[PDB]
From a paper:
In this study, we determined the cryo-electron microscopy (cryo-EM) structure of the HHV-6B gB ectodomain in the postfusion conformation at 2.8 Å resolution. Specifically, the two fusion loops of HHV-6B gB, 102VGVV105 and 187WLY189, were replaced with 102HRTT105 and 187ATH189, respectively, in the final plasmid construct. Like other herpesvirus gB, HHV-6B gB forms a typical trimer with three protomers tightly packed together, resembling a long, rod-like structure. The ectodomain of each HHV-6B gB protomer is divided into five distinct structural domains. Each protomer contains five intrachain disulfide bonds, with no interchain disulfide bonds present in the trimer. The DIII long α-helix of each protomer together establishes a central coiled coil of the trimeric gB, and at its apex, DIII folds back nearly 180°, which contributes to a six-helix arrangement at the apex. In our resolved structure, the HHV-6B gB N-terminus, starting shortly after the predicted signal peptide (residues 1–19), directly forms a short β-strand with residues 27YIR29 that contributes to the formation of DIV. In HHV-6B, the first β-strand is positioned on the outer edge of the DIV and interacts with the central region of DIV to create an antiparallel β-sheet. For our HHV-6B gB construct, which did not include mutations to prevent furin cleavage, we observed a relatively low proportion of cleaved protein, and the structure we resolved corresponds to the intact furin site. Our structural analysis of the HHV-6B gB 396RRRR|D400 furin site is consistent with previous hypotheses, showing that it is an exposed loop on the exterior of the gB trimer that does not interact with the main gB body.
[name] 6B (HHV-6B), a β-herpesvirus that significantly threatens immunocompromised individuals, currently lacks targeted antiviral therapies or vaccines. For HHV-6B, entry into susceptible cells—such as T cells, neurons, and salivary gland cells—is mediated by the fusion protein gB and the heterotetrametric gH/gL/gQ1/gQ2 complex. Through a structural transition from a prefusion to a postfusion conformation, gB mediates viral and host membranes fusion, a critical step conserved across herpesviruses. As gB not only mediates the essential membrane fusion step but also affects cellular tropism, it represents a promising target for blocking viral infection.
Numbering used by the authors:
A (entry chain A), B (entry chain B), C (entry chain C): 25 to 383, 391 to 633
The structure:
Amino acid sequence: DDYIRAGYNHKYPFRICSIAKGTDLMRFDRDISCSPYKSNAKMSEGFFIIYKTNIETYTFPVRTYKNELTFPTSYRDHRTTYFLDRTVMGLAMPVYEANLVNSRAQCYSAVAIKRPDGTVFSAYHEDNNKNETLELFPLNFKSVTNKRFITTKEPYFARGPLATHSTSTSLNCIVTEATAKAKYPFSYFALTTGEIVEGSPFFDGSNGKHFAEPLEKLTILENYTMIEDLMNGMNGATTLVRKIAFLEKGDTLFSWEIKEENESVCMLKHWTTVTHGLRAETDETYHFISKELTAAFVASKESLNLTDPKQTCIKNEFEKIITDVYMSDYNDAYSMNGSYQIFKTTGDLILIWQPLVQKGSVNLRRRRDLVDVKSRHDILYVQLQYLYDTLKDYINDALGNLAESWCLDQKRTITMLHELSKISPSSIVSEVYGRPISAQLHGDVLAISKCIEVNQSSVQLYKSMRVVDAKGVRSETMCYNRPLVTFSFVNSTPEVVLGQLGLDNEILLGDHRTEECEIPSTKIFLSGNHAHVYTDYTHTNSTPIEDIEVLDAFIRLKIDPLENADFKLLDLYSPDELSRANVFDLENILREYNSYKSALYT
Amino acid sequence: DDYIRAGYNHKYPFRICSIAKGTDLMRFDRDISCSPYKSNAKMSEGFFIIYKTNIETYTFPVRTYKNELTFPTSYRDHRTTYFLDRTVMGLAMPVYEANLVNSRAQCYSAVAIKRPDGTVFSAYHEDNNKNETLELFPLNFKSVTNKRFITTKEPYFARGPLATHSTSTSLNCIVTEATAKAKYPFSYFALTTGEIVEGSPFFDGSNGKHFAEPLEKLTILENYTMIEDLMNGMNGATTLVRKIAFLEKGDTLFSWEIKEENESVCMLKHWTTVTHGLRAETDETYHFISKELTAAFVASKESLNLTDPKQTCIKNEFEKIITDVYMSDYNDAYSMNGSYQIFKTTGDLILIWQPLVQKGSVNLRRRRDLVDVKSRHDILYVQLQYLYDTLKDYINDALGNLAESWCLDQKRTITMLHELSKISPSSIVSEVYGRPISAQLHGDVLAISKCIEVNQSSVQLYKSMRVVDAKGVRSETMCYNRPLVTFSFVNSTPEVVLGQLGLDNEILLGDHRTEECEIPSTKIFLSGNHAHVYTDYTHTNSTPIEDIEVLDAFIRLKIDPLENADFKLLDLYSPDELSRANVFDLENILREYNSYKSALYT
Amino acid sequence: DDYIRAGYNHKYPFRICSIAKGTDLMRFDRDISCSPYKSNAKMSEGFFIIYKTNIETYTFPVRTYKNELTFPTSYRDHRTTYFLDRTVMGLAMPVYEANLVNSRAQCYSAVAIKRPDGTVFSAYHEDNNKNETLELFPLNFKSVTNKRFITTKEPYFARGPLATHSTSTSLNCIVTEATAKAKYPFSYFALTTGEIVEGSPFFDGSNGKHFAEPLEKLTILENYTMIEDLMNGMNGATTLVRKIAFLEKGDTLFSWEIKEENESVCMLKHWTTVTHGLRAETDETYHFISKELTAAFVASKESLNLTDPKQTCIKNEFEKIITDVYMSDYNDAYSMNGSYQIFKTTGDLILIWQPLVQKGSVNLRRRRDLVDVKSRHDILYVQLQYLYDTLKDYINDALGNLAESWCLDQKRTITMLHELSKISPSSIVSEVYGRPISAQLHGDVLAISKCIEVNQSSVQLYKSMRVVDAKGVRSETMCYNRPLVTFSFVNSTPEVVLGQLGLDNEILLGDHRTEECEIPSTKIFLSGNHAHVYTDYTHTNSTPIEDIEVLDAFIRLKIDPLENADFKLLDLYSPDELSRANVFDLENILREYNSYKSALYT
Ligand SMILES: *[C@@H]1O[C@H](CO)[C@@H](O)[C@H](O)[C@H]1NC(C)=O
Ligand SMILES: *[C@@H]1O[C@H](CO)[C@@H](O)[C@H](O)[C@H]1NC(C)=O
Ligand SMILES: *[C@@H]1O[C@H](CO)[C@@H](O)[C@H](O)[C@H]1NC(C)=O
Ligand SMILES: *[C@H]1O[C@H](CO)[C@@H](O)[C@H](O)[C@H]1NC(C)=O
Ligand SMILES: *[C@H]1O[C@H](CO)[C@@H](O)[C@H](O)[C@H]1NC(C)=O
Ligand SMILES: *[C@H]1O[C@H](CO)[C@@H](O)[C@H](O)[C@H]1NC(C)=O
C-alpha cells in the first residue's frame, strides 16, 4: 500500500476548513488605555497630641490633733502586778486648743471631760491645776511623711497600788502631719495611716458635695492662719488659708484646707506628642499613624468639644504645645490649615489633631530617644493596628504597580499579536480564540471561518511528495511542499476524497501547492501524534512526537503559598510566681490572724 | 588595504555554523494546561458560642447573732477616772435564742455564763431578774449591705466607784445581716467585714466537703423557718429552708443556708455569640474566624464532651441560644448539618461550634453594636491570629491569581514564539536555548546544528559589496546583500578563507547571496562591537555600536523591598502611676502601724 | 462623485511620512543581564537561652520566742464579773533562755521584770519559786508553716476577787517557727503573720547593709548550734550555724540565720531554651527569631558583659546548658564558631546567643511539647514582632522571585520585538516609542523618520482600485493593493494632491503599489474610524469600526486591593467581674471596720 494511517490528537483534530460561508470579520483592539497606579488612600499631614485619663489620686496634707490620758503602762508594783495601770483613752483636741497649736506652736495644760450627766471634769499634768501652755517636740526626728510633734516624753507618772489599779496623771498632746488620698468621685478620703473620712475633701457649706459625717462635728473657718511646719517651732512661717475645715471624728480632730475641685483636679494627663503624623481617612473612621511610635489610633469621624471644667484644664497646655511644635519644625514649609480638632479614639484616648498644609521644599529634621524602663504593655492594640495598616499599604502599592506594568505588557503583547497575525493568521487567531479555527487576511481585517470536523478513520497519507503526470510520469521540476492526504469526510459517508495536509492537522482541497524539487531534502511533517519523515520527497519513517525533545520555553514563577501558623501562648511568669512576688498577702494575713484569734479563746 | 579588522563581542562571537552533522530536531510544547486558581483552604460555614471560666465569687447571705456585756465605757466618776469601767466581752447567742430571734424578732433578757468550774451565772438587764423578751431596732438606718438590729441604745448604766472599777449591767444583743464570698475550691468562706470560717459553705452531715471547724460547734437543722428581713419586724414574711447551719465561732454565732453545690455554682459563663463564623481546618488544628470580632480562635481537632456537673449547667442555655440563632438568621437558606461540637481553644475557652449546610440564594442580614467601656485587653492574641490569617489568605489569593495569569501569558508567548520561529529560527531558538546556535526549518520542525567558534584574528571585511566578475569587472546588476568577510578559522591554522557575514557575528560559506543593485543605499551592518556603514555598496565609516541610541523596550516593575521595623515598647502608665493609683496600700499601712506600735513601748 | 470623505482618529491621524531628512538610527538592546533573586537579609544559625528577672521574694525561716503573763481571762467570780482578770502583757524571751530552748528544747520557769526604777521582779508559775525547766508541746498539731511550741495549756489559774481584779500566776512560753520574705532591695523583711523588721536580713556587724532597728537590741553570735525542728523534742538533730542574729523587738525575740547576699540571691531566672534559632541582623539591631515559640527578640548590636555578683550566679548554669545543647543536637554537622555573646533585648531580657557554623549534610531532629495552663499574656510583643518579620520575609521573597521572572520575560520579549521589527518596523517601533512614527530597515538597523501631520479636510478615497491607463482604459492585469487617497496637505495650502493609503492612517506618494487583479476579492481597509469594503477592486460599503467585534486578547489580573480594617477592642472580663473575683477587699474591709469603730463611741 502507498498510504499510511494517520495519528490522532484530542485538541487538534483533522478538520476541513473551507470558506463555506466565510464572513465573521475580526480585529484586534489596539486602543487600550493603561492607568498609572494612583493610591486610593486619602492621607493628610500634621501632628497630634495624645492625652490619657489621670489615674493618680488627689493627695493633700492633713493635720491631726489628739489629747489623751494614760496611766503608767505595764505597772507591776504590788504583788498582783499592781493590777497594772492604764488610762490609755483619749479625746479630740478642742478647737481653741487647735488654734493655739496652729498659732503659737503650743498646747494647753488642762483638758475638760464631759460625763453623760453633764459635769465637766478638770484634769491636769502632775495635778498642778494650771491652765498653762507646753511646747511640742519632733519625736522620732519627724520620720518621713509622718512628722508628729509631742509634748510629753512618756516618763514615769504618779501611781500607787491599793491592791488594785487607780491612777491617771499623764497629759499628752499628739499633733501629726499626714497626707490623704481620694479616687475620682471624691466621695471620701483616707489618710495614709488608715483613718477614713466619709466625705468629699472639697465639701463646703453649700457646695452640695457628698458628705456622710455628722454636720455638728464639722467646723469651717475662713482666712485662717497656721504654721507651715512644726519643726520650725513658734517662729515658723504662717500662710493664710481662705477656707479650712475642722472635723472631730472619734478621739481625733482632723484639719485640712478646702480647695476648689475645678481648679485643683485635672482628669486628663499629657502622654506624648507626635511631631510627624499622618491621618488616613477610611469610610467610617480616621486612622492617626505615627511612624516614630509605630502606633495607629482609630477614632470616629466626629470631632469632640471639650466643655467639662475638669477636662478643660489642659486647653492652655496643649495650645502652647501646638504653638511650640509648629514654631519649631514646620515654621516655613507648612502653614496651619485651620483650627485643631479633638477626637476620642477607641480605648478612650483624647487625641488633638492639628492639620498642616503645603510642603517650600525641605524642612528641619530632629531626632529624639527615650530610655524608659519597661514594666507592662497596655496599648499593644495600637501597634497591632499599625502593623496591619503598614502591611496593607505596602501590599496595595506593590500590587497596584504590578497591575500597571501588567497592563503595559498586555498592551504591547496585543500590538505584537496584531502584527504577527498578518503572517500566520490561523494559529494566532486560534490561540486567542481558544478553539481551532481558520482565518484569512481580507485586506486589513481577519475574516475567520468556523469549520467542521471529519471522521478520524481513513486518514491516509501518500508516501510520495513527487508530482506525477496524468500519464504516470513523475515531474522532476514540481514537488508538493506538503504531503497529500486522503480522508473519508464523516463516517456516515464512506466516500473517500484526496486532499493536502496543512498545519496542526488541517486539510484543504483545490490546487495542491507545489514548488521546485530539491535533491537533498529531509522535511518532517507533524500530523496527529506521529511525526513523519520525508527524504527525497518520499516517506521513510514515522515516529511518535514524544521522541523529539522539547524546548523549555516556559518561564516558571518560583512562588510557594504561605503556610498556616499557630501562635502558641507564651507565659513569662507562672501565676505561682506572681503569687510569690508579694511580701504581704491580705488573704494569708487575715486567715492567720483569724486562726490565732480563734485559738485565743483562753 | 581593501579590508577592515572586525570588532569583538564576548557573547556573540564570530562562529561558523555549517550543517556538519545536523540532526538534533527540536519542537515547541504548545500543549500546556493552565490550572485556574482554586484555593486550597478548607472552610465550613456556621456559628459558634464562646464560654469563659467564671471568676466571680459565690455570694450568699449570712446572719450573725451576738450577745455581750459592757460596763459604762470611759467612766471617770472617781478621782482616778473611777478606774474606768468596761466589761466589753461577749458570747455567742444560744441556739434557742437564735430560734426566738428568727421566729418572733425578739431576744431573751437573760443570759447564762459558764465558769470553768461548771457553775451557771445569771445576768439580767438592770438586774430585773426576768427572762422576758426585747425587740430589735435597725441601728444606723440599717446602712447598706450591713443591716444590723440591736436591742440596746447603749445608754448610761448602773455603776459606782469604790476607788476601783466594778460594774456590769448592760445586756445588748447584736443581730447582723452580712454577705460571704468563696473562691472556686470552696474550702472556706469569709464575711465582707473580715470574719473567716474555715469550712465549705456547702458542707453537710456526710457530704465529705472540706471543713476545719470543730464539729461540736456545728448544728444542722432541716425545714427551718426564719424571717427574710428584720426591718419588717415580727410581721415579716418567713421562708422555709430545707437545710440551715448554725456555727458558734468565738463570741459570735453564724447562720447560713446550706444549698447544693451542683445546682448553685456554674463554672462557665457565656461571653459572646458569633452569628456568622467560619471554621478553617489546618493539618493539626481548627481556626474559628469571626469577622465581626476580628478574632480567630485555635482549637485542637478533638471535640470535647461536657460531663462535669459544674460544667453542664450551660447545656440548656447554649442549646436554646443555638435554636434561637438558627431560627432568626439561617431559617431558610441553611439547614443544621448534624449536631454541634464542643472544642476547647488554646487559652481555655469553651467553643460550641454548630455546622451549617447549603446556601436558597439570599439570607436575612442583621447588624449590632456595643458601647462597652474599655478597661484592659486580655485576649489580644486572638486578634493577632486573625490578623495573620487574614493577611495570609489575601496574599495567597492574590499570588494564586497572579500565577494563573502568568501561566496563560506564558502559554500565549510560547505559541507566539513557535509562530515566529518559522521566519527567523536562529535568533528565536538561540534566545530560548540561552546559547548562540544555528537552526533551520526542516519542514514543520526545527533542526538545530551545534557549531564551533573560530579565532578572533584575521577577521577582515571587504569594503566593496559589488559583485566583481572573474575578469575584474563589476556587475552593475548584482550586488551582495551582506558584506564579504574573511576569517582564518582557528589560530592553529593560519590559512585564510573568504566567507559572507550573517547575523549576530555569524559566517557562512557557499554561494554568496546577492540581489539587484540600487543607486541610493545606506545599509548599516552590525558586527562585533562596531557598526559599519555601506553607501553605494561600499564602506564609508565604522563607528562603535554605543553611538546609536537604544529604544527603551524594557518595562520596569516599580517594586521596592519591605524594610525592617523595630516595634518599640510603649508604656501608657508608668509603674509609679500604678503605685499612686490606689488609696489604700497594704505595705504602707502595715509598715506605719508596726512602726507606731513599736514606738508605743511606753 | 468618485470619492468618499474619510473618518478621523485622535491618536492615529492621517500623516505623510516621507523620508525628508531620515537619519535617526535606532536599535534594540538585546544585551540585558537578569539577576537570580538573592535575599539581602543576613542570617546566622545557632541557639540562644533567655533569662528573665527574678521576681520571687527571698524566703527564710525565722524563729520567735515570747514569754507572757495572763490572768485567768473572762473571770466572772464576784457579782461585778469579779472585775474580770487579765494580765495579758508579755515580754521578749531573754537570750540565755533562748539558748536553753535552742539546745535542750526547754524553757526556764522564772522570769525577771524590770521596773522603771530599776528593781528586778521575780515571778513564778504557781508561785513555786523555782527556776526549773519545762518542756514544749506542739499546740494545734503544729498546723502548717506555723509550727509553734508551748509549755502551758492555758488552764485555770489562782485568783480571787476582793470586789476587784488582782491576779497574775500564769507563765507561758511561746516559741514559733515562721517564714519571712523580702523584696529586691532587701531593706526590710516581714513575717507571714504580719510582723515587720526594718532591716536587711543579710545585715552583719560591718556589712554596711540597711538597718533601722536599734543596735543595742541586736545580738550576733557565731558557730551557734540549734535544733532543726521542735517536733522532735530535745533529741532533734542540731545544725551548726556560722552566724545567727537575735533581735528583741517589742515583746518578742526574733532569731534568723545570717547568710551571704551574693551566694543566696540570684536576680536572673532561666525562662526557656531555644535549640533552633536564627539571628537576623538589621542596620541597628539584631533579631533573634524562634520558629518553635513564634517569637522574635530585638536587641541592640552591643554585647553585654555580666559582672554583677548577683547576676553572675547563672554563668555555670547557662554554660552547662550550652554544652548540653551542643552535645545533643549539633554534635557533628556544626561546630561552635567562637564564644557566646550576651545581649539585653528590649523589655529587659538577658539573651545568651551562641553562634554555629557549617551545615555534614543532615542533623538529628527532636520534638517537644508543653501543657502549661494559660493565666496571662505579658510578652505578646515578641509574637507581634515575629509576625511582622515572617510576613515581611515572605513578601520580599515572593516579590523578588516575581521580579526575576519579569526580567527574564522582558528580555525574551525584547528579543522577540527585535525579530518582529525586521518584518513590520513601523508598527513595532511606533508601539515601543509611544508616538506614531515611520521606520525602515536600513540593513541591520532601523532608520526612523519623524514626520508631520496634514489637515483633516479633503481626505477623499477613490472608489476604484483598478489601474486605469492614461487613455481612460482599465488594466485588467494591474490593480492597486491599497485604495488611492487624495489629501490637501495642511489647511493653509488649499492645493490637493493624490496619494496612496497605507497603514494606521498613513499616506505615501511615489509609484503606487499594484499587483495582479483577482475576480473574487472582498478586501477591507481600515481608515480613521470607518472601515471601507472593496469588492472587485471597487468600493461598496463604509461602516464604523465598532460594528466588527473585537478579539479579547487582553489577559486580566484578578487582584483586588486590601480593605481597611478596624480591630475592635475586646474585653474578656468586665472590670466589675475583676472587682467581684476577690474574696478579700482591702478598701471594703477598712471602710467597714472604720465605720464600726466610729459607731463604737459608746
Ligand atoms: C478675707 O476673707 C473674707 C471672708 O472671711 C472675705 O470676705 C474677704 O474678701 C477676704 N479678703 C481678702 C483680702 O482676702
Ligand atoms: C420536710 O423536711 C423533712 C426533713 O426534715 C423531709 O423528710 C420531708 O420530706 C420534707 N417535706 C416537705 C414537704 O418538704
Ligand atoms: C568556727 O567559728 C569561728 C568564729 O566564731 C571561726 O573563727 C572558726 O574558723 C570556725 N571554725 C570552723 C571549723 O568552722
Ligand atoms: C460645641 O460647643 C461649641 C460652643 O461652645 C460650638 O461652637 C460647637 O459647634 C459645639 N459642637 C458640638 C458637636 O456640639
Ligand atoms: C463522651 O461520652 C459520651 C456518652 O456520655 C459518648 O457518647 C462520647 O462518645 C464520649 N466521647 C469521648 C471523647 O469520650
Ligand atoms: C567587659 O570586661 C571584660 C573583662 O572582665 C573585658 O574583657 C571586656 O572587653 C569588657 N567589655 C566591655 C563592653 O566593657
